[PDB]
Design a protein around this ligand. Structure first.
Ligand SMILES: *[C@@H]1O[C@H](CO)[C@@H](O[C@@H]2O[C@H](CO)[C@@H](O[C@@H]3O[C@H](CO[C@H]4O[C@H](CO)[C@@H](O)[C@H](O[C@H]5O[C@H](CO)[C@@H](O)[C@H](O)[C@@H]5O[C@H]5O[C@H](CO)[C@@H](O)[C@H](O)[C@@H]5O)[C@@H]4O)[C@@H](O)[C@H](O[C@H]4O[C@H](CO)[C@@H](O)[C@H](O)[C@@H]4O[C@H]4O[C@H](CO)[C@@H](O)[C@H](O)[C@@H]4O)[C@@H]3O)[C@H](O)[C@H]2NC(C)=O)[C@H](O)[C@H]1NC(C)=O
Ligand code: XUT
Ligand code: CA
Ligand code: CL
Ligand code: K
Ligand code: NA
Ligand code: ZN
Length: 805
């Protein structure tokens, strides 16, 4: 109930919300059915439109007008945005040359440059180039300020998950808004685009920027605008707020546009109808900048122009139907569209089985345009699993397609030509970032980055301490002229041991054998030096990784590789090796096929054993440093040490062997040498974070050898590929992956073919940031380079995407 009989007199777009049944005058009262009776009349004036004309100049203040052209309007803070242009012979902001803003130029009483976030729904990254002729204001912001060629949204690339990720710095799995539509089984409640449940605070986790600001004494404009408030009015309201007295004036503001998304859905991302929405957004940017200029704020405010996601061509006819795969289609609930999420229609039905639903959906049709996953098997880069609102069964839908339950769902609901929501690596899903103002750099292009990073930067812009989030604070320092955040490297928590030779061969009873009993003073000081770290500068190029948790581990040196060997997990946490352009690939000699050798530096009690692998009929083993890349027949024996062994399903060994035999050398050839760090990952609770030992769900049968959920590799080289990886004077180039360690290759539909037809495709799908690996392992990489730490942070957030131009 609202007693809608109070009044908005002098309260129009009030900043503090009043509590029902008292009537509201804030920019959200409409959405709650709570506005006072006179809200439209007082607060939503439209008379005479949005612009001054020659004949309105110096008019007598008529309070009924939408905006004003009277002499007193500047001091009132309510002129039309083109007032000075029409009536005072001023130029529009867009017509002025750009001039570097070296320092904030702010009216007296401003304690900090205000921040204005101008968010545009569905603004695909290529609109910047393709619509440039019709967006002169946006283009000026872009070329004069700091811009990225695109910004990566989060998955799913829908509006709510992305705007709330912008506001919090969190992955959807952590902030809780995991789609535009959700069921939370704990609440037994559903979240929908339409309706009232979405307003309940229990959906919205983390701490969004407006709450972070308020808690730390920085006042915020109210971020959300009711759909019926026209754009012109939103701008005028922001401009009016900026005229409040110092003690009342917010420092941070948000504008949101439903365009171009609204039209993109109807006409497709490049429909001829899309030009007008782009012109109209540009005109709105023009109104804001002209309005700031009138208030002498155009060289004081930092403006961020940011999108939530792009838009792809998608039509009704490109829909896959679950009714073409499943017999039991009525026993499931599907969240449909550009992603799929499946659960049982009824929790009382004990005949529901996810294993058989997944199998019925797996590689069933030659050109199948979706792929089913258990959520924990989704690419780790999507960070889309650790939330009870995310159903166990997920369908990743190919770009340009939909998934629906039954045909009736599509024609009893072609309307649309655009949609979005797909995998956040998809080119058409990328969106925009421009920063313009005193605190951003001048005429600077920065590489693409992810929208989870922006919260930290928005906090830096406002002098706020960010709540804990998934950005990597300092990774976007290169966007900023000042207010940079200068982090220190995390402290190493565990120091390694450096074991020498301590065990005799006969102390080991591991059930392992090797054909290695064949017998030199010249070459015997040589082997000793190698085991003491003589070649370590070659193979460990960026320092050893730091272990950021409490554990017991040994550094092990070898001719061709160095490893940090965990006495707790019985295998390396990391193995580091460098492969030059010139390196040669050899085979595993016949006599050494099943060779595993005790490591006399490491106790039998802290070693794996071959008997466990023999007994475990499902599980085989692989090696972290690849025997194929040994530098000499003699060095090859090191690759067969029990301390280089890791557990691997036979199906996974197909993947791993092709990576090690073919791909590593291919990259070294293409990149002029590579440094590789590989290792296991254990993430049994799929939270993106390193497991402790007591979280491990699977061991090699009859042993304490834990089975990894994933294997990573970090592959580093010189960005200037004229220099070899091991003699690089400047910036680095990296690509990484986190491959799922699975007992089958059901994910790859072409896996009965030769590994040259499917393995690299699988690896590309599981591309990762070094930072993703850092979370999953508790390791910190690149500790010793000649590069600045912020540069290294940017490198650690880099994702190699494998999309074309
Ligand atoms: C991305 O960045 C984010 C933010 O930094 C990272 O997420 C953090 O990770 C931490 C480790 O997982 C986690 O710390 C835990 O906090 C628990 C208290 O949680 C509440 O308080 C915070 C602070 O305000 C709040 O943010 C939380 O909000 C969550 O939950 C509500 C709903 O309940 C949601 O509205 C909200 O969206 C958010 O949900 C997300 O996180 C939760 C986990 O908290 C997930 O379950 C959800 O799926 C969702 O993803 C909370 O309101 C605290 O209780 C934990 O302490 C336990 O573990 C420690 C280990 O140190 C142990 O010693 C303690 O005893 C305790 O164990 C006890 O409880 C266990 C479980 O019941 C039980 O098994 C034991 O026996 C014990 O009884 C823990 O410290 C932190 O909460 C989140 N923060 C956020 C916002 O998500 C994230 O990791 C980053 N991602 C990556 C890949 O890097
Ligand atoms: C919620 C809302 C955005 N809103 C609003 O005023 O937002 C202000 C804001 C600005 C910046 C923020 O973050 C920051 F500053 F950090 F960048 C956060 C919020 C009103 C719109 C209603 N909405 C929809 O109806 C809607 C629209 C489209 C889709 S779809 N089909 O997925 O495209 C789905 C739903 C979206
Ligand atoms: Ca984990
Ligand atoms: Cl959704
Ligand atoms: K076996
Ligand atoms: Na297969
Ligand atoms: Zn949309």
């Amino acid at each position: 109930w609202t007693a809608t009989s109070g009044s908005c007199k002098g309260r129009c777009f009030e900043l503090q919300e009043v509590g029902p049944p008292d009537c509201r005058c804030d920019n959200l009262c409409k959405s709650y059915s709570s506005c006072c009776h006179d809200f439209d009349e007082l607060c939503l004036k439209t008379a005479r439109g949005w612009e001054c004309t020659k004949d309105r100049c110096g008019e007598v203040r008529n309070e009924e007008n939408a905006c004003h052209c009277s002499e007193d309007c500047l001091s009132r803070g309510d002129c039309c945005t083109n007032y000075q242009v029409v009536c005072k012979g001023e130029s529009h902001w867009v017509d002025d040359d750009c001039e570097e803003i070296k320092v904030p130029e702010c009216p007296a009483g401003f304690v900090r440059p205000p921040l204005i976030i101008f968010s545009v729904d569905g603004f695909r990254a290529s609109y910047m180039k393709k619509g440039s002729k019709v967006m002169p204001n946006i283009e000026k912001l872009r070329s004069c300020g700091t811009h990225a060629p695109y910004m990566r949204p989060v998955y799913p690339t829908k509006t709510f998950p992305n705007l709330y990720t912008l506001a919090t710095g969190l992955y959807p799995e952590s902030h809780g808004i995991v789609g535009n539509s959700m069921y939370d089984p704990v609440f037994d409640a559903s979240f929908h685009l339409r309706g009232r449940e979405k307003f309940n605070h229990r959906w919205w986790g983390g701490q969004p920027l407006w709450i972070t600001a308020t808690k730390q004494g920085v006042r915020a404009g109210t971020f959300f605008w009711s759909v019926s408030i026209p754009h012109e009015r939103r701008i005028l309201t922001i401009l009016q707020w900026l005229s409040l007295p110092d003690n009342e004036r917010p420092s941070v503001y948000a504008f949101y546009s439903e365009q171009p998304d609204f039209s993109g859905h109807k006409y497709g991302p490049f429909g001829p109808e899309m030009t007008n929405p782009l012109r109209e957004i540009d005109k709105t940017v023009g109104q804001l900048m002209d309005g700031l200029k009138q208030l002498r704020l155009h060289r004081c405010v930092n403006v961020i122009f940011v999108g939530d996601h792009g838009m792809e061509d998608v039509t009704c006819d490109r829909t896959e139907f679950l009714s073409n795969y499943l017999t039991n289609v009525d026993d499931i609930t599907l969240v449909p569209g550009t992603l799929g999420r499946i659960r049982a229609k009824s929790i009382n039905n004990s005949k529901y089985d996810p294993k058989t639903i997944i199998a019925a959906l797996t590689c069933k049709k030659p050109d199948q345009h979706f792929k089913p996953y258990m959520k924990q098997h989704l690419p780790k880069r999507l960070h889309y699993a650790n939330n009870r609102r995310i159903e166990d069964i997920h369908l990743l839908v190919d770009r340009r397609w939909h998934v629906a339950r039954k045909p009736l769902d599509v024609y009893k609901k072609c309307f649309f030509q655009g949609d979005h929501g797909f995998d956040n690596k998809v080119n058409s899903m990328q969106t925009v970032f421009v920063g313009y103002g005193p605190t951003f750099k001048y005429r600077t292009k920065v590489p693409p980055f992810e929208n989870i990073e922006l919260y930290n930067v928005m906090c830096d812009l406002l002098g706020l301490k960010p709540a804990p989030n998934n950005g990597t604070h300092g990774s976007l320092n290169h966007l900023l002229r000042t207010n940079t955040f200068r982090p220190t490297m995390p402290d190493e928590v565990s120091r390694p041991n450096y074991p020498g030779i301590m065990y005799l061969q006969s102390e080991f009873d591991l059930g392992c054998t090797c054909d290695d009993k064949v017998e030199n003073k010249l070459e015997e000081l040589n082997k000793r030096l190698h085991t003491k770290g003589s070649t370590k500068e070659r193979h460990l190029l960026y320092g050893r990784p730091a272990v950021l948790y409490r554990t017991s581990y040994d550094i092990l040196y070898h001719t061709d590789f160095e490893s940090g060997y965990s006495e707790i997990f019985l295998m390396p946490l990391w193995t580091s090796y460098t492969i030059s352009k010139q390196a040669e690939v050899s085979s595993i000699p016949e006599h050494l096929t099943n060779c595993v050798r005790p490591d006399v530096r490491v106790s039998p009690g802290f070693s794996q054993n071959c008997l466990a692998y023999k007994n475990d009929k499902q599980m085989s083993y692989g090696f972290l440093f690849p025997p194929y890349l040994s530098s000499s027949p003699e060095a090859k024996y090191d690759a067969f040490l029990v301390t280089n062994m890791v557990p691997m399903y036979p199906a996974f060994k197909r993947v791993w062997a092709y990576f090690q035999r073919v791909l590593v050398k291919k990259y070294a050839s293409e990149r002029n040498g590579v440094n590789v760090i590989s290792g296991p990952i254990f993430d049994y609770n799929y939270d993106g974070l390193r497991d402790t030992e007591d979280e491990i769900k699977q061991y090699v049968e009859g042993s304490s050898i834990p089975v990894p959920t994933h294997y990573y590799s970090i592959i580093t080289s010189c960005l200037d590929f004229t220099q070899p990886a091991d003699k690089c004077d400047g910036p680095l180039s990296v690509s990484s992956f986190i491959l799922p360690h699975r007992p089958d290759n059901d994910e790859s539909c072409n896996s009965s073919e030769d590994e040259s037809k499917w393995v690299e495709e699988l690896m590309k799908m599981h591309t990762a940031r070094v930072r993703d690996i850092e979370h999953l392992t508790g390791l910190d990489f690149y500790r010793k380079t000649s590069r600045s730490y912020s540069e290294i942070l940017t490198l650690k957030t880099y994702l190699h995407t494998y999309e074309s131009e």
